[model samples]
Target: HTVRAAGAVLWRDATVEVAVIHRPRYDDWSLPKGKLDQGETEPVAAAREIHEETGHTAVLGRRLGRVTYPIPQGTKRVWYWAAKSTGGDFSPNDEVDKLVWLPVDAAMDQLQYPDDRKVLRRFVKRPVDTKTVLVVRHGTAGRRSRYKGDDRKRPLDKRGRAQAEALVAQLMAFGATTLYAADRVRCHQTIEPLAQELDQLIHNEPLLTEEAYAADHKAARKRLLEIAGRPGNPVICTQGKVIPGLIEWWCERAKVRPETTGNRKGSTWVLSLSDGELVGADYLSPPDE
Candidate 1:
């Protein structure tokens, strides 16, 4: 019997929702499964295949059973295991026509293969911890006289540099590990000092850049949401203009307005997205004051 790798049906919720892949070419819906790669174990291969096909990472669960399916030249025996989706952003790719999270009964009815149906029938539900995200905006920018070339090419001024250093200290106290920044001179400049102190490189993703003044707030909000939804160690540095929106959007998304303790520049706030609640928000008092 040829060894084959397979993932049993999985779901995002307790409603017996099973994840399915739709193939437009064949106009069929099926459970995600695939063959094993060299040096890859059956479970690992199965999880990887499911992610490659469905855009979601699955947690391996108990093995349900195995079934044999006949191919053109030979018969292949596939191992199946129940899996729980750990995390991912759902975006359909070329291989998959579409991905659907369906109810258990509907998923059973829609499965394309009999063997897959049998495998999913034995699936059991389990709890999973989702990913958490934290968004951090970069400090102020340097004065125009401090750097030459276009505004985008300017670095942080002395005061801006000082603020950046302070921001880094604050984040380090909070125990931040990874840092991502927008591809802009001011943004990079603000984070550079902190990155150096932390001994971590700032990952600059251009897609996060805010081009015009009008869209800065919106872009910042979107980036904050994206970061908040990200998995694992998460920290980011953009620009000061982006911070207000990040805090405001986080508040709105979490449905709780944090208490404003003071009116000062360079304030930082922490809010919970679970129920739209704010835990705390405070402004960093100016040094001179």
Candidate 2:
């Protein structure tokens, strides 16, 4: 029986994404792989095949075990490895029609071989440190009245109330431990339900509110980064109005782009901000309308 080898290149956080090589001839999504040359070691052959098929250079992390499967001629031995992508681009000439990064769960579902699934499952179970943050936008607020004394005192309308309730249901799904809100009434109203559900008091930081607008949006962002950077805190920042300019600033700091769609009111997005990347700009979640 002939022996072969392969590697899986993985990346991304929150969701794991993997580089998948598509073979038009085989009409399936598979990892980059090839038979071992007579003189090559398993790891060397696996890495070489991955680069040749996917146009990526990867550093092998650990051996993932092997599988024996029948080909048209006979059963073949295939060893696999877990790898981190170092560099490279997709090569079109190697029968690799396309290369795609797929979320871990999605990629698992699309895997062509059961042995590959078994190896991937084992790799996923290994412990690795991770940080997760959920950003929620504040709920809808009642329109400001012409006679209003404090615009910040604006309360939620009936629709706003329903939206807040729905948001609470959504927040419960996030397992949020720390709830921080801008000191404005609207921001409090938005966070109230989730705080209650979590059995924790809403820690109203005055600097987080519209009152802090004096600091300018830029300064406020810096403050946010400071908060999010602290150790052991999975923060939920509930705020009003995430304008495009502010959105761009925050996204630039988070090193991500805002995903915009028509009629998207109160939509929430998550951004991963590493330490020293930006001040006050690490975390953002715009509330639903």
Candidate 3:
């Protein structure tokens, strides 16, 4: 069996300085990371572990890639992300006794394992200070044909409700503050859990609905970018029919190809924008998965 873990290149001041911590147990300087807690997803675990080890609240950005090394019991696989340190300060803890913020080059030199340095290389390869907008596909509503009511009013199934609840932590890891959903009820329900957590309102997006997009996709695209232009990062939940076309169109304009174009229910696209231009898109499976 593989031992799964997650960590972050916790950067501050627009990636000018990244944190490197010293673990007294092993007496090695490394990035903040830890094994996943039971039933926790990697993204959630990444933020949680970083806070535990570094005493900083981090807003996760793009995936910084993964690193693997052999452990005695099994192979250990660790995923890393580019995380911006929002606030909090270091305090000596059981896991990490001393934490220092150093330049990326210096942090690389301080880290003991080559694998840790390799992760840092991937981190600095992209724009670390990009704004993140979470684009989500509404959770699994019951089949369209089976619903006796108007399709627009269809609600999420039991499993989909579970997925929405699970999405709160995953979406929050990227510091989601604003919420938007298409006109459909399922879309609103999908992100409602996150809305409740933020104690914020879910803004309605009539232009982002399937019928609305079918009528005018160009307007949908423009409206989405306009929303992205706003101050805070947004979490958008829309229909399956709307997500793929909108994302494909944006990717075409941005000249970047995502690993998977498939849009599964309850999944999220972490859209990274630098100076209001699409720079990177990373897909995340539904938290329940």
**lDDT values, one for every candidate:** 0.58, 0.57, 0.88
Better of 1 and 2 by TM-score: 2
Better of 2 and 3 by TM-score: 3
Candidate 2: how large is its RMSD?
16.4
Put down candidate 3 lDDT per residue, 190-274, tens digits, no spaces. 9999999999999999999888888999899999999999999999998888887978888899996675456889999989888
Q: Candidate 2 — number of clashing residue pairs?
A: 9
What's the distance in Å from true for residue 146, model 2?
2.5
lDDT of 1: 0.58
Model 1: ten consecutive residues of lowest lDDT: 125-134
Across residues 123-186, which tens digit of lDDT does each residue of candidate 2 receive? 5654212233445555567566786434677777776666666665434332346777676677
Candidate 1 local Cα displacement, residue 84, angstroms = 29
Best by lDDT: 3
| TM-score of every prediction relative to native | 0.43, 0.49, 0.92
Clashing residue pairs, backbone N/CA/C < 3 A, model 2: 137-286, 137-287, 221-280, 222-279, 222-280, 225-280, 266-287, 266-288, 266-289
The C-alpha local distance difference test score for the whole of candidate 3 amounts to 0.88
The C-alpha stretches of model 1 lying farther than 4 A from their native spots are 1-137, 142-150, 212-220, 261-267, 271-289
Number of the predicted model whose TM-score against the real structure is largest: 3
Which pairs of residues clash in candidate 1, taking residues 3 or more apart in a chain or in different chains? 142-156, 142-157, 254-276, 255-276, 256-276
- Give the candidates in order of lDDT, highest first: 3, 1, 2
